[PDB]
């Protein structure tokens, strides 16, 4: 504390704190005859002493401090967000008081003399009080008096006060509690309860105790963001450093506990050097509760009985210090927002210490406290299934904590009702199709957070949701088969679209830091072993592949011999992210588009700044293994040249998102994505349309981009490519990868190229092989550039410069000022000898494929290697074709004529929804030439032709096998 006024307009953000760690510490305080002020070193919040106030009822003391109270607007301007000036302090009662402490603000006040507030004194332990001086008093600039009046209707009494503070605080975070009413309240949990109730029986109680034990087992024998410490020397050393001691008639003294978010009320950047030094002595709750958990785990594993007892005493003392510090029911502590980050491992520690807390008579206090602070999560913790219940962050950061809270309930019947209700909650959250863009699983196996398919959030949710189902398995509390089935679909999908990292197009805002299925591995074991007919051989076979375990290892793990899954082969459509996956041998190709319902990219203030082209009709090829080891290197990466994309090559200042904070650019129409045929063949249809008026986006940049994928190959075609500037800098990237000693060779037309730097220009009938063994045959292009070159780029978080050496090739569309086009073919198993053979078949009147149509209405690709035809109806149309005559909606149709049958698939990749509305099915009428008889696809012969009726739900393809009528 200084001689300056509070909120000194001179230095508004500098908190004025009465902590008494300074010379003449009571200088600014006066008392009436019926009050006595002493320092005590018995307990304190900041510095080693607190104000002991002995009083008779109605007696006052006065703090004399000039307050220049800012408006909410002036506070907000000073800090840069919605702010209010706050008055706060800590008080300790050694015994409860039945009445109210009155705090009054005014000028030159005395016992007998503007505005003020009340604090109920019915409690023991530390409590914090924090009120907005502008919004929470029942204030003219001349305030110099803060009068603390003991309650009238109570004969005498005593109170410890510390850390009386004037600060600028976040306007969201002065919360009401059992001591103070503010303008803000986080209402208490009100648990839902499902009927019928399960009875208290030995069988149901035993199942509850086995669920608790199974949780203990998971935490005592590696969690992300759990700073595990197993060295007991280290736990004892950290614990002693808390300087906790039990006091005579109750409570503790030890270092003050504060959450990472509670520190805001101090404005610590702006603290005077004296206050900062004391503040720096606080303990961050996150660290403290992590320590409680590590001690609990060590306790559970400890074989030495002396050490074991010591670890229990350490845990219970930490528990007593935490409760006495005011982390108790009815104590807001001004705020506890983002409570999970500070407390998640406290919840889990209570499972391990449940019997110790029972014996110490602390279980009801710890349960009431955790329940109270959990009210921040009321939307999930109440356990009433809603459109928001499928929250993927919940499944990651809160679901096991939620279970642990319920198991901590002291009454047996209520504990069984809560865990029964939880099982129903989790089942519904894992079963329902949330409307619109809300979080959760989807029927194609995509899994959404931030209103789209998001592996970076779904992968940790899959791990923990699988664990939850496994914890409850084979009990009266087991998750419904419908939730198991949905989660299996999403997790088998993740195995398909990862190799073992998700591709660049699925990286969300973390390009070059893709999530890996390796982090989810244990979830496959958990979900396999929780099957109704356990083990689920598909999920077990994936667990062994991903975890690098052999068939010989399977018997001990699963109780029967299972062969590790081979990599999935064929084509899989995922219109939930307007993508598809083509798999052949050890390669995965991620084909990705975007549309009204699928954002192109997530770009934040410091994430994915150059990610504009993440979903521009990309076709990233990934062999099984590290993507970095295959040359997907962020340093020097040209963000313009995403593999398969058609882009405008821009300087990075122009490619950067035009929004300083968040942009999630959605497309201009519902239709773009993929479809599949026989689980083997795929097609992408991408209508590249830019916004009419977004800064840095050329409103006239357009392209129609189709890909047909079958076996070892993909046919890429593009048409109707345009820009505002005659296709200047408009380019289609064949590939880009870093040059390393392992990635040193390109082939061009049978010649080995290793020089750096190197440039050449190729054209129709030329071919290349990149260092990852992908071959590219140029089948239509005037100008293909190939470059081995030093590149300068910038990293996606802070735009700081990077550099690296890269091999790349791209089509230059500037040679066709209007409606530029391309065709090329990729071989996934290319060798110079096989590419010589494919080039020869291309020169033989194109024995590889034929484009039957390539315009703004339809792209039709006949693959002559596979004998499959792909039809990208960008618009409804009548066509001239052997098989297809007409389609009445934008759609993707595919055909395969085999021996005695014609197989037809159809879909729209349009999800037919908004951010708000549920997807509904689209009816697609596909007329085919000839008379056919036979899948849920309906057909009707109609003259010399056959009407097929497809139902496209969430872009999930349907197919039918037809055979000719005579
Ligand atoms: C603040 C911001 O830039 N984005 C908001 C999200 O926050 C980020 O995402 C998450 C997360 O999803 O866990 C945590 C961090 O705050 C940020 O990286 C997020 O807000 S959240 O309440 O913090 O989670 C979302 C809201 O959820 S959502 O649309 O799935 O409903 O809003 C983002 O904009
Ligand atoms: C999409 C996203 O940001 N997800 C969050 C995680 O970050 C990804 O994973 C990790 C990582 O934790 O190694 C690092 C990068 O930030 C992302 O690639 C991660 O956020 S965190 O900022 O890394 O802590 C997790 C945190 O989960 S936790 O709450 O289990 O610790 O939240 C993600 O899902
Ligand atoms: Mg003090």
PDB file of N, CA, C and O in Angstrom, residues 175 400 773 914 957:
ATOM      1  N   UNK A 175     -18.824 -13.131  -8.222  1.00  0.00           N
ATOM      2  CA  UNK A 175     -19.950 -14.078  -8.117  1.00  0.00           C
ATOM      3  C   UNK A 175     -20.529 -14.041  -6.696  1.00  0.00           C
ATOM      4  O   UNK A 175     -19.733 -13.926  -5.726  1.00  0.00           O
ATOM      5  N   UNK A 400     -14.450 -37.836 -16.404  1.00  0.00           N
ATOM      6  CA  UNK A 400     -13.989 -38.771 -15.348  1.00  0.00           C
ATOM      7  C   UNK A 400     -14.093 -38.073 -14.005  1.00  0.00           C
ATOM      8  O   UNK A 400     -14.373 -38.766 -13.001  1.00  0.00           O
ATOM      9  N   UNK A 773       7.760 -41.732 -53.874  1.00  0.00           N
ATOM     10  CA  UNK A 773       7.357 -42.789 -54.822  1.00  0.00           C
ATOM     11  C   UNK A 773       5.982 -42.546 -55.450  1.00  0.00           C
ATOM     12  O   UNK A 773       5.335 -43.524 -55.881  1.00  0.00           O
ATOM     13  N   UNK A 914     -27.857 -26.254 -41.546  1.00  0.00           N
ATOM     14  CA  UNK A 914     -27.167 -24.980 -41.204  1.00  0.00           C
ATOM     15  C   UNK A 914     -26.371 -25.182 -39.907  1.00  0.00           C
ATOM     16  O   UNK A 914     -26.363 -26.305 -39.364  1.00  0.00           O
ATOM     17  N   UNK A 957     -23.114 -41.995 -48.999  1.00  0.00           N
ATOM     18  CA  UNK A 957     -23.512 -42.606 -50.261  1.00  0.00           C
ATOM     19  C   UNK A 957     -24.383 -43.826 -50.048  1.00  0.00           C
ATOM     20  O   UNK A 957     -24.249 -44.490 -49.033  1.00  0.00           O
TER      21      UNK A 957
END
